[PDB]
Design a binder for this molecule. Structure first.
Ligand SMILES: CC(C)N(CC[C@](C(N)=O)(c1ccccc1)c1ccccn1)C(C)C
Length: 175
């Protein structure tokens, strides 16, 4: 099985939307795009919820980000472009598009940014737990290997640093 196979766009079905539904933890990312490297540098932890709306091709996103030892919560909707296998988010006068990609491990997922551009591409890595196994991490490294991004360029979260669970639990009461 060739290295790049899981870096090819895959159309998103209802089944794909079911598979991504729920809580994910941000594990790691690496990009050649400087803007993304800059934004991500400062993220210490992040977890999020996806609630797809299959009929509107949107996904409701609730996001719990830790930067500078404090909790920033945002909710918004992503749009789904099923055929291209991408999801998009409007983030300040700009639509941002990412390819939804998969690894052998069904408890992970990744998003590819600027995948058609060798000067800007990158990958972000997510798991259903804030800790990953060495198998999950190797799959991610292999994907980076395909983009010729060295492993040493990877930026990681630190689940020790999460400042957001006290907000998530406070949100659970109301909902
Ligand atoms: C700052 C933080 C929010 N970013 C993630 C952006 C991302 C992605 N490409 O993984 C996305 C961007 C644009 C369009 C879709 C998805 C996403 C994935 C899952 C959840 C939140 N957001 C960093 C790690 C780059």
């Amino acid at each position: 099985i060739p290295l790049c196979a899981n870096l090819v766009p895959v159309p998103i079905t209802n089944a794909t939307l079911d598979r991504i539904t729920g809580k994910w933890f941000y594990i790691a990312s690496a990009f050649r795009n400087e803007e993304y490297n800059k934004s991500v540098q400062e993220i210490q932890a992040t977890f999020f919820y996806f609630t797809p709306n299959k009929t509107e091709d949107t996904i409701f996103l609730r996001e719990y980000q830790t930067r500078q030892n404090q909790c920033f919560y945002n909710s918004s909707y992503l749009n789904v472009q099923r055929e291209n296998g991408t999801v998009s988010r409007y983030e300040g006068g700009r639509e941002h598009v990412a390819h939804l990609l998969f690894l052998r491990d069904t408890k992970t997922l990744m998003f590819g940014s600027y995948l058609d551009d060798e000067k800007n591409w990158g990958l972000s890595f997510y798991a259903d737990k804030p800790e990953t196994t060495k198998e999950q991490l190797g799959e991610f490294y292999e994907a980076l290997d395909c983009l010729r991004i060295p492993r040493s360029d990877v930026m990681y979260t630190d689940w020790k640093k999460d400042k957001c669970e006290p907000l998530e639990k406070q949100h659970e009461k109301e909902r």
